[PDB]
Design a protein around this motif. Structure first.
Motif, PDB file in Angstrom:
ATOM      1  N   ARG A 110       0.830  -1.201   0.000  1.00 52.52           N
ATOM      2  CA  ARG A 110       0.000   0.000   0.000  1.00 52.52           C
ATOM      3  C   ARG A 110       0.867   1.254   0.000  1.00 52.52           C
ATOM      4  NH1 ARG A 110      -3.409  -3.242   3.283  1.00 52.52           N
ATOM      5  NH2 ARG A 110      -2.505  -2.427   5.223  1.00 52.52           N
ATOM      6  N   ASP A 113       2.541   1.958  -3.591  1.00 54.85           N
ATOM      7  CA  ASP A 113       1.586   1.670  -4.652  1.00 54.85           C
ATOM      8  C   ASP A 113       2.196   1.958  -6.018  1.00 54.85           C
ATOM      9  OD1 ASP A 113      -1.199   1.030  -5.540  1.00 54.85           O
ATOM     10  OD2 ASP A 113      -1.091   3.101  -6.267  1.00 54.85           O
ATOM     11  N   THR A 217      -2.710  -6.526  -6.391  1.00 55.50           N
ATOM     12  CA  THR A 217      -3.512  -5.326  -6.180  1.00 55.50           C
ATOM     13  C   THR A 217      -2.838  -4.315  -5.259  1.00 55.50           C
ATOM     14  OG1 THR A 217      -4.738  -6.314  -4.330  1.00 55.50           O
ATOM     15  CG2 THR A 217      -5.640  -6.628  -6.551  1.00 55.50           C
ATOM     16  N   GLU A 220      -4.972  -4.518  -1.642  1.00 48.78           N
ATOM     17  CA  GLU A 220      -6.404  -4.301  -1.534  1.00 48.78           C
ATOM     18  C   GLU A 220      -7.038  -5.397  -0.680  1.00 48.78           C
ATOM     19  OE1 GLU A 220      -8.117  -1.756  -2.386  1.00 48.78           O
ATOM     20  OE2 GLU A 220      -6.611  -0.672  -3.562  1.00 48.78           O
ATOM     21  N   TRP A 224     -14.015  -7.020  -1.433  1.00 50.09           N
ATOM     22  CA  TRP A 224     -14.317  -5.703  -0.890  1.00 50.09           C
ATOM     23  C   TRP A 224     -15.812  -5.421  -0.952  1.00 50.09           C
ATOM     24  CZ3 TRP A 224     -14.859  -0.756  -3.873  1.00 50.09           C
ATOM     25  CH2 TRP A 224     -14.905   0.359  -3.028  1.00 50.09           C
ATOM     26  N   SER A 297     -16.288  -6.681  -7.936  1.00 53.98           N
ATOM     27  CA  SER A 297     -15.554  -7.170  -6.779  1.00 53.98           C
ATOM     28  C   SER A 297     -15.481  -8.690  -6.743  1.00 53.98           C
ATOM     29  CB  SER A 297     -16.202  -6.665  -5.484  1.00 53.98           C
ATOM     30  OG  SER A 297     -16.021  -5.269  -5.333  1.00 53.98           O
TER      31      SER A 297
END
Ligand code: CS
Length: 361
Positions: A110, A113, A217, A220, A224, A297
């Protein structure tokens, strides 16, 4: 063997009692299930992570805390966290491990990114798969493989990190975020493990596929917006996670292979490592991307004479088909083009249409 189910025996056999004076605590770096985590120095002195046990512990809490080190000390691999030792004779209880400067994998991705190449992400996945292959060959089932339990050092080496016991499943079904407690989350656990508590190396493979998705991802959240109950129902009905953005078709293919409903059809970790290494050594196989739809998703589950003539708008020939003896479908599918000419379909376009339609049957 069975050296993974007796915490006290494991502590006795596979840990090194460190004296408290040799440990210097420096700075809080996290909050663990049992207490705070510090970066410090161990005696030249080396940097280390220091897990502490909150004061006022139960005897069983102490046992479970030190049991993690009892398990960790049994392993030795480039992609498994190294145990320096434990403090068990003086309070507070402590576990000493090698320091991982970049911390948990998901938080790290994260923070970074888009700053890595797909090849580097696949290399991280190869390292994780190497660790899990080691664990599987040692007859160790992790039960709780997720990006949050993978640590990263300065050289972007990823290592499996969480070796707790008394692990139980997430019970909150209406939840969407992370639930409180050191529970095994539903979103990383294989179907048979949720339904029948059958944790195996194949269920670890499932969770590894989830980790692959996590990496591609950049950290992520799987499924979600969905709830744990919705996740369970989706997985049971055939739904799966969708393609990450900018994901090699081969990598998503492998993820989906990990998520096979029947655990026996999933790839073993040796297969996983071989596939990832082949891809890395021939990186041109990572340029073909899998279709991306930013709206989803989850991926949908997969699917399992007058009417036929009207399907191709030729219902007005029906009577002809009845007059020439072609009264059933089983005989029409065995029909040749010369039979079509003979029965009265003289126009070439009609012959062509009937022939192409017949090919399908
Ligand atoms: Cs010991």
């Amino acid at each position: 063997p069975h050296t993974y189910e007796d915490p006290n025996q494991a502590v006795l056999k596979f840990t090194t009692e460190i004296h408290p004076s040799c440990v210097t605590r420096q700075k809080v770096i996290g909050a663990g299930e049992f207490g705070e985590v510090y970066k410090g120095m161990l005696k030249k002195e080396v940097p280390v992570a220091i897990k502490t046990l909150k004061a006022g512990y139960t005897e069983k809490q102490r046992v479970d805390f030190l049991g993690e080190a009892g398990i960790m000390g049994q392993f030795s691999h480039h992609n498994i966290i190294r145990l320096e030792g434990v403090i068990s004779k003086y309070k507070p209880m402590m576990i000493i491990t090698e320091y991982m400067e970049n911390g948990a994998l998901d938080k790290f991705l994260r923070e970074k990114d888009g700053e890595f190449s797909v090849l580097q992400l696949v290399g991280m996945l190869r390292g994780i798969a190497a660790g899990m292959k080691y664990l599987a060959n040692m007859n160790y089932v992790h039960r709780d493989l997720a990006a949050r339990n993978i640590l990263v050092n300065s050289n972007l080496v990823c290592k499996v990190s969480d070796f707790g016991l008394s692990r139980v499943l997430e019970d909150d079904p209406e939840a969407t975020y992370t639930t409180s407690g050191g529970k095994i989350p539903i979103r990383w656990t294989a179907p048979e493990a949720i339904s029948y508590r059958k944790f195996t190396s194949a269920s670890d493979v499932w969770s590894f596929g989830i980790v692959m998705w996590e990496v591609m991802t950049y950290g992520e959240r799987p499924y979600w917006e969905l709830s744990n109950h919705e996740v369970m129902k989706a997985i049971n009905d055939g739904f799966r996670l969708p393609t990450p953005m900018d994901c090699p078709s081969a990598i998503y293919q492998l993820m989906m292979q990990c998520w096979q409903q029947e655990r026996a059809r999933r790839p073993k970790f040796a297969d996983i490592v071989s596939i990832l290494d082949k891809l890395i050594r021939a990186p041109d196989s990572l340029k073909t991307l899998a279709d991306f739809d930013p709206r989803v998703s989850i991926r949908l589950p997969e699917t399992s004479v007058s009417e036929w003539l009207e399907s191709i708008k030729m219902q007005q020939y029906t009577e002809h088909f009845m007059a020439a003896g072609y009264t059933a479908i089983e005989k029409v599918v065995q029909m040749t083009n010369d039979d079509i000419k003979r029965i009265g379909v003289r126009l070439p376009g009609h012959q062509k249409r009937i022939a192409y339609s017949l090919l399908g049957l």
